[PDB]
């Protein structure tokens, strides 16, 4: 009912793999139409592949989002062939670990281009309509690090703090049209790209467990309600809330001996 | 299916009548056993009936959330009557509005008492047999005045902060063992003990629209999916979470002349 | 200059030593008249002792900061022997650590009463004074537990963060009378209590640095300019905020492997 | 003693003018030696005059913030002509009001680049000669926008979020080469440039007093103690913290009818 997001078109950014295509399987299996960019044909060609293996129809187009001029195109594109966007997902992004005083100004420019810039490029870009049509959702994927700071992350960190402010101040600028505009918060979410810290008691993996008081690592299904939740109308009244996913971290002092 | 309540029991305290009674409404809808308590038997009664006009199959039980030993002995009949509790919402509360200056200290410690003190001792009752079971949640009704002041709410205020870092201990400390416990702050919520605020305009609702994002008070259907949401196996990774539902106040610097 | 307290009052209550006596320092060295109060009458004469030795004339009355009443009589005699109370630091408190599940309500009282009940009470009583001669500083001693939670400490938290939000409200309530009522948030400081936990490469030695970017404890030293500066007219436009003095801890993710 | 800048250099950027300059003089007035830059010779020479007329022997230099070569250039001068910088305050920025949908995402770009990438690459520059001395300071300015959103200043509020973590990561990154990266947060600031606003009774007077705890604008004198704190080693043991200085509006829901 209130948690279906049949008949809605969703556009999640960067979605032809990774956190962004699952949160796009969750989003299909709640009723919503997928759409999904990424940057070279040959991503949005095997995305749209692992949809249909998952028999999920999805709509595939290749953007950049730091592209103001294409991504205009591609949103009429979105409406003519499916229709206006309802939901939009701002997932797609970079992060560089780099000590600050060995980065480069063009690297720190790019990860806050990409990370800050692009969500509101996109999220301008999907606004029109969903005023038009009297209701929309944009959910920006935020980061423990845009509460918290670490050794290697400046860029990213402050383009995720960044982009938890420009949540808030879409939330406050649309809210009276009807858009709800918020913050998913993953904390450390287990992907195969950080297999390597969970073989086997690892340092790594004890970190994480010690500052979890769930005690594990996230999941990518754990994000799928909290990312279904604040796509449907069961979230109507929240609005410039970042909705932290994280078993805890950002509530607790840390495990200690 | 991630965010049904069916088979799950859930105690929310003080459900007799107002937002309690309709987080319970929205509960059984979803699936949930509702199980309620209050101070009075006359109010335990009503509140049953009320119940049962909308087919709900509630269980009441007269106790005083300020009374341990009172509410050791609640959670046990709860047990043998309905079964263990997966889901406590701390509703029960009062508000007092005086200046600080003029407030008994007696009404001040009243205040801190029912809305911080007794979330601890029902949470302390319920959580043996949550651990137990293998899951738990505790959701603590907080408010905006969990973050910001007023004059005249000095102990409500003091009350609320003081909930939202309970929340945020229980999380810490139990979340190990499947615990989630987060909160949910409502925004103004529009009531009837409110509707001369609201008369054709009014200066109090244009001060309310003026702060609100969303431009319009809050209803209890607002609080539905949100309240469902953290009751539900969909949010077992938000923990020590307060999920503010208020149209986006928190957010937002006001509407400017 | 703007950082002095010459000629100011400041009662700072439980400084018969600790915390509380190292602030008191740093305030008579600021030029301020030291005020200060302890439940027994042997706290209070060798503290008086310990403040001569150092050449500082304080000021010292026995009273429990819970009992209204006697804080009442205790500023109004502080009025006749001193003059009127120009700075409030509401430092004494309690520290329980103690399960959640095995910590008996009339302990989690206790907590709540000393630590987040008497600072209304001992603020309630200066303020009429200060409003009347037109400035007015409260100083309310926090915690990381303002912020972040930890097993066996829920009671202290919740007394913690409802002393953030005490602080805010007064601030909210009182602001247009000149009182400017904010917060110290100390992170880890050594103390000779803990000298154990720092006793030579210990693990919670070890969690302390790898928690805080400074890679240190703090001292009480570290507290001195932070407390001066809130009591002094250097701050007449920070009002409502907890300045928190860790090192940084609440802003990093943490040291990691 | 604590609160002395007295042999310390401070680099101001952008304090030809404004809130900078005033910064400038306070850090002056308290023994510092000033350093500051701005993008055009005229505002420079303009600059060095009215410290003249002041008594004030600064140093001014031309550079645009935004020039990562030209302002590692400016530091090495610096460090030639006056010393290694013990201090900077990252001032320079500029605003933009703009509804969102109706902003270039070149002036969006323009606004991150001076008012977030900027910081970063003036702090980089600053940081190798304060590790090697054994102490450093970053102040960087905030916004009330850095916790809160509005309509129109959509790039400013992404920009001053990012900072603040910009601020909390630094502080984590450099805090153990005793380096504290901490924010100073300005509420509203009467400035002649705002004047018409405070006309006699104003409708925005009446919105910034309501809002406001102290019933009033703040001044740029508000913002010296504060400044001077974060600069001095009275602080510290202060990291990664945004002080804001802005009367309680932060901490307060506002002034209701």
């Not at 490029?121 to 845009?146: D, F, Q, Y």
């Not at 402010?165 to 939330?171: G, R, Y």
């Amino acid at each position: 009912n209130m948690f279906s997001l049949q008949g809605k078109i969703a556009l999640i950014t960067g979605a032809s793999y990774g956190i962004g295509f699952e949160i796009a399987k969750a989003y299909a299996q709640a009723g919503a139409t997928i759409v999904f960019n990424d940057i070279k044909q040959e991503l949005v060609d095997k995305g749209l592949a692992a949809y249909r293996e998952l028999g999920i129809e999805a709509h595939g187009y290749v953007c950049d989002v730091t592209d103001e001029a294409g991504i205009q195109q591609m949103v009429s594109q979105i409406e003519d062939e499916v229709g206006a966007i309802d939901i939009l997902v701002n997932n797609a992004g970079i992060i560089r670990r780099t000590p600050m005083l060995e980065m480069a100004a063009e690297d720190f420019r790019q990860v806050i281009d990409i990370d800050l810039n692009a969500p509101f490029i996109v999220s301008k870009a999907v606004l029109p309509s969903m005023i038009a049509k009297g209701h929309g959702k944009i959910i920006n994927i935020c980061s423990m690090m845009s509460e918290l700071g670490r050794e290697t992350v400046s860029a990213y960190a402050a383009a995720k703090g960044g982009l938890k402010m420009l949540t808030k101040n879409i939330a406050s600028e649309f809210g009276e049209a009807n858009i709800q505009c918020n913050g998913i918060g993953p904390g450390y979410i287990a992907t195969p790209q950080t297999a390597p810290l969970r073989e086997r008691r690892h340092p790594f993996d004890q970190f994480i467990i010690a500052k979890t008081p769930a005690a594990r690592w996230g999941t990518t299904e754990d994000l799928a309600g909290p990312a279904v939740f604040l796509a449907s109308d069961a979230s109507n009244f929240v609005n410039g809330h970042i909705l932290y996913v994280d078993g805890g971290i950002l509530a607790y002092i840390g495990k200690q001996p």
